[PDB]
Amino acid sequence: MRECISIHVGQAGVQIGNACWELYCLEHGIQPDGQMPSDKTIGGGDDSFNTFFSETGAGKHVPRAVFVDLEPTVVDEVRTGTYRQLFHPEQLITGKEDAANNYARGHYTIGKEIVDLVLDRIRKLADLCTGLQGFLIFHSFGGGTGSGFASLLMERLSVDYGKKSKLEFAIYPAPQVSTAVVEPYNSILTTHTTLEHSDCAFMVDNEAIYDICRRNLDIERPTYTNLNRLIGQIVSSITASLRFDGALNVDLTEFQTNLVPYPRIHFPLATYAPVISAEKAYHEQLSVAEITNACFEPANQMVKCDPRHGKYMACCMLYRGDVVPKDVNAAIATIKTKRTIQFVDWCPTGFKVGINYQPPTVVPGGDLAKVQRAVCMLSNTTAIAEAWARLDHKLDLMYAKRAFVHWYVGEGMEEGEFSEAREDLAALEKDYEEVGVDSV
Amino acid sequence: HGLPFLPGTSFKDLTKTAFHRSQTLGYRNGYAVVRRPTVGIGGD
């Protein structure tokens, strides 16, 4: 069993799910026509695809993923591109007008528009699940449908399903560079409502992956596609324990118990250790102890924040490939003997480990090199609170004059939720201050 | 090599690349179905 349902909402969600599902078809034998090649075996064969693919009576496989957007443009290259025959037609839901970088458009007028259809499609996709682990949400904080419609979607998902695991993946607002100018409003309003409804919110941002592709990979001028490929590698490493044999398995429920200590601190940061080019793999080892240390390097983080500016509350190391557990234990033991890496008092253990045997695959035309070992690091740190300070300052700069608000109050939203969301984020900042103080 | 089965007398096959698992123990209408296995780890 062990089925997972992916929900890609927004332009960022769809362009991430393209890379993710190309990857998923590459781990197994699934081709873009929707079928494997021919039988190769008398009678039964592999069934590792049941994590993500539902298979009909003939040999065709359908992804367990709902693609949602309010704009028809981004989804239509999936309907006409290479993977048009793989997806069920009713699995790609579009609107006619988008949210136009407006939270209330995506939550009150066009959000409640299409939320019933995707809920029905989720019900139909969850009816094929003999054993269902949890839902995966891919969205961006700066969007209108990635912020408004995702919030309402997880809201009604918590209403209709109860305590099903909702691991969400977010593209955080970068500190310096940004696209929209109403982006802090959307981030504030999408944190205020999903502060509870998300079980654990795995987060990345575009600027840190830009820096990674600049320094680690040897590509000047990366685009969104390389970022989507790295995010897809992270998601493949996260769920690899449900599909491949390993020495220490991990389910989707274990992340929320080993990473979320308190009912509001559920924003860990992702890291991928051996992201190096093929021109630099010729020279160096990729050993367990060498690339375990590369996870805790500040320059290799996938969120533009300094781990030296806070304390590590918990970690979730997801090893992958030819990893010897003795080297894992030695590397994690020698991590704790450093003063640059500091841990909180009330977590003497700190680490949750996982070992998988299947090495990462090679996407043709990709950037990463073929390696035997890979680490996906999930760190919950107090150093995220300096990003909330910057976000709060960005909201308070243009909330003092109340700019770009007539697009929100005028259309289907009162004004009091702005003040309420500011109170909620300020309370979260004080909580992050409280949990970082040592009980000496 | 006909060695005794003692702690340490095991040597892994490093040329093996596929590590896929099957769903031998699945489900049905309401019943914990159990299937006889036909493939090992990797699909062989």
Partner: peptide, 24 residues
């Protein structure tokens, strides 16, 4: 399909056949 060289998603996501890894 002329989108192999006209759009970003086409050059990014088009099918190149995978190669069998381990040499004989």
């Amino acid at each position: 399909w002329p989108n192999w060289h006209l759009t970003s998603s086409g050059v990014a996501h088009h099918f190149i056949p995978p190669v069998s890894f381990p040499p004989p």
